[PDB]
Scaffold this active site. Sequence first.
Site, PDB file in Angstrom:
ATOM      1  N   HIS A  12       0.779  -1.262   0.000  1.00 17.45           N
ATOM      2  CA  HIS A  12       0.000   0.000   0.000  1.00 17.45           C
ATOM      3  C   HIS A  12       0.801   1.298   0.000  1.00 17.45           C
ATOM      4  CE1 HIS A  12      -3.915   2.189   0.607  1.00 17.45           C
ATOM      5  NE2 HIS A  12      -3.104   3.253   0.546  1.00 17.45           N
ATOM      6  N   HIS A  14       1.593   4.787  -2.851  1.00 17.46           N
ATOM      7  CA  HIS A  14       1.243   5.414  -4.101  1.00 17.46           C
ATOM      8  C   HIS A  14       2.462   6.081  -4.849  1.00 17.46           C
ATOM      9  CE1 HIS A  14      -3.332   5.663  -3.252  1.00 17.46           C
ATOM     10  NE2 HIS A  14      -2.926   5.488  -1.978  1.00 17.46           N
ATOM     11  N   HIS A 211      -9.563   1.094  -1.063  1.00 19.60           N
ATOM     12  CA  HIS A 211      -9.623   1.908   0.132  1.00 19.60           C
ATOM     13  C   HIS A 211     -11.040   2.068   0.827  1.00 19.60           C
ATOM     14  CE1 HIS A 211      -5.936   3.461  -2.016  1.00 19.60           C
ATOM     15  NE2 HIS A 211      -5.723   4.415  -1.078  1.00 19.60           N
ATOM     16  N   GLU A 214     -11.155   4.188   5.954  1.00 15.04           N
ATOM     17  CA  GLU A 214      -9.976   4.907   6.327  1.00 15.04           C
ATOM     18  C   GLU A 214     -10.430   6.112   7.015  1.00 15.04           C
ATOM     19  OE1 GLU A 214      -7.704   6.779   3.131  1.00 15.04           O
ATOM     20  OE2 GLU A 214      -6.490   7.819   4.553  1.00 15.04           O
ATOM     21  N   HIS A 235      -6.794   0.168   4.199  1.00 15.67           N
ATOM     22  CA  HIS A 235      -6.843   0.730   5.520  1.00 15.67           C
ATOM     23  C   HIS A 235      -7.818  -0.053   6.386  1.00 15.67           C
ATOM     24  CE1 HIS A 235      -4.487   4.671   4.803  1.00 15.67           C
ATOM     25  NE2 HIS A 235      -5.133   4.743   3.602  1.00 15.67           N
ATOM     26  N   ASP A 292       1.932   4.327   2.456  1.00 14.04           N
ATOM     27  CA  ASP A 292       1.003   5.024   1.643  1.00 14.04           C
ATOM     28  C   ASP A 292       1.428   6.171   0.704  1.00 14.04           C
ATOM     29  OD1 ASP A 292      -2.061   6.614   3.040  1.00 14.04           O
ATOM     30  OD2 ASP A 292      -1.688   6.068   1.001  1.00 14.04           O
TER      31      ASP A 292
HETATM   32  C1  LIG Z   1      -7.613  14.541   4.384  1.00  9.75           C
HETATM   33  C2  LIG Z   1      -7.127  13.133   4.673  1.00  9.75           C
HETATM   34  C3  LIG Z   1      -7.989  12.037   4.042  1.00  9.75           C
HETATM   35  C4  LIG Z   1      -7.160  11.030   3.271  1.00  9.75           C
HETATM   36  C5  LIG Z   1      -7.989  10.010   2.523  1.00  9.75           C
HETATM   37  C6  LIG Z   1      -8.318  10.368   1.062  1.00  9.75           C
HETATM   38  O1  LIG Z   1      -9.384  10.830   0.696  1.00  9.75           O
HETATM   39  N1  LIG Z   1      -7.344  10.030   0.235  1.00  9.75           N
HETATM   40  C7  LIG Z   1      -7.311  10.495  -0.983  1.00  9.75           C
HETATM   41  N2  LIG Z   1      -6.426   9.997  -1.841  1.00  9.75           N
HETATM   42  C8  LIG Z   1      -6.394  10.743  -3.112  1.00  9.75           C
HETATM   43  C9  LIG Z   1      -5.562  10.293  -4.226  1.00  9.75           C
HETATM   44  C10 LIG Z   1      -5.689   8.964  -4.650  1.00  9.75           C
HETATM   45  C11 LIG Z   1      -4.959   8.471  -5.705  1.00  9.75           C
HETATM   46  C12 LIG Z   1      -4.129   9.328  -6.412  1.00  9.75           C
HETATM   47  O2  LIG Z   1      -3.586   8.854  -7.581  1.00  9.75           O
HETATM   48  C13 LIG Z   1      -3.927  10.635  -5.967  1.00  9.75           C
HETATM   49  C14 LIG Z   1      -4.649  11.118  -4.862  1.00  9.75           C
HETATM   50  C15 LIG Z   1      -7.213  11.805  -3.097  1.00  9.75           C
HETATM   51  C16 LIG Z   1      -7.371  12.755  -4.189  1.00  9.75           C
HETATM   52  C17 LIG Z   1      -6.530  13.861  -4.312  1.00  9.75           C
HETATM   53  C18 LIG Z   1      -6.702  14.774  -5.361  1.00  9.75           C
HETATM   54  C19 LIG Z   1      -7.750  14.576  -6.287  1.00  9.75           C
HETATM   55  O3  LIG Z   1      -7.944  15.337  -7.442  1.00  9.75           O
HETATM   56  C20 LIG Z   1      -8.601  13.490  -6.110  1.00  9.75           C
HETATM   57  C21 LIG Z   1      -8.398  12.586  -5.092  1.00  9.75           C
HETATM   58  S1  LIG Z   1      -8.101  11.960  -1.586  1.00  9.75           S
HETATM   59 ZN   LIG Z   2      -3.652   4.948  -0.267  1.00  7.45          ZN
END
Ligand SMILES: CCCCCC(=O)Nc1nc(-c2ccc(O)cc2)c(-c2ccc(O)cc2)s1
Ligand SMILES: [Zn+2]
Length: 349
Positions: A12, A14, A211, A214, A235, A292
């Site tokens: 997990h 990215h 996911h 979380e 998560h 993550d």
């Molecule tokens: C505030 C804490 C909460 C955390 C949990 C959450 O929502 N995670 C997220 N991951 C991405 C994400 C996923 C994959 C990726 O490849 C890049 C980002 C988001 C994203 C960010 C920007 C966006 O435009 C859309 C979703 S939001």
């Molecule tokens: Zn993630």
Amino acid sequence: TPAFDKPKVELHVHLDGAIKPETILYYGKRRGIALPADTPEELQNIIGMDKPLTLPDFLAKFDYYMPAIAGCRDAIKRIAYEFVEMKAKDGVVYVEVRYSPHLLANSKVEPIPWNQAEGDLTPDEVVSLVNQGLQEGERDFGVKVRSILCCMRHQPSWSSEVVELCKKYREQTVVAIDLAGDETIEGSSLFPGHVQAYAEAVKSGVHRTVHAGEVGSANVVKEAVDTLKTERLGHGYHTLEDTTLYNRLRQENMHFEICPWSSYLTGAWKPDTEHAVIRFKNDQVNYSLNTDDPLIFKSTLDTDYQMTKKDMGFTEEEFKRLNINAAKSSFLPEDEKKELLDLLYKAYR
Ligand SMILES: CCCCCC(=O)Nc1nc(-c2ccc(O)cc2)c(-c2ccc(O)cc2)s1
Ligand SMILES: [Zn+2]
């Protein structure tokens, strides 16, 4: 000072939140995309965190850096190559890495990601370059690498390109689909573009993870399991809000992708309580430890283990137990899955 100096696996993490400041800030120059700083150290400070942010504040971080790398064809393969080394320096013998094809693209993607202009670099080309980076990466650093393509919650109309990208590039290096993004969008799990991308995966035996749980509710998790049919959770911490859900998933030997440092920094975990991982540990759950996004969280794999080593009691025994579980839970073919496992066993005794 490393909390667990043994080989590790990680399931997990990215790509788009594991770029070196140096490299982001490099493509910024190389192509005119004006970032909020000009030496690496203050990028890692701006584009990084140490309190619970808000969700808006968090996503906006993605708005800083991404357009330096997205749309640039060699920054793509390069963040992938750099990724693999970053992991050999962690001590990881196997990683699956994830990202969204779409959001490094600038052509043949509606809508165009990150405020970019149009282009030449398609979702499909994206995956190709990531394969290259990652798999040169394997060859030099000694990591086993698979990738995983992310569906995005707020875009169920991409989801079909995602499973089909998955099918198009299978073991080379793609092994699973994911669902990622804002899990708090109302009803996003059951949006049909996603429900069908996942039923396509079942169909064409691509492995699946999601996911859930979380920052969102137990019902997010059950939707994941019952409707998208996941094999593993992203998560899953809120699973414990529903005792039967939990119980069953303990019966089912489900894999939770834990991210301890990740979770504090997101609000996901409330600093007062019993960290969910401590539960999972005391109830013998099948979980794994994971960073993550090490960029945003200005972290490394060892940081996660350090948090639990010293904040939550975790022993060497446990650490070992969970890389075991992680290996077992991987989306590797079964022949290779047991090869990982025997590496881990010889290294573990
Ligand atoms: C505030 C804490 C909460 C955390 C949990 C959450 O929502 N995670 C997220 N991951 C991405 C994400 C996923 C994959 C990726 O490849 C890049 C980002 C988001 C994203 C960010 C920007 C966006 O435009 C859309 C979703 S939001
Ligand atoms: Zn993630």
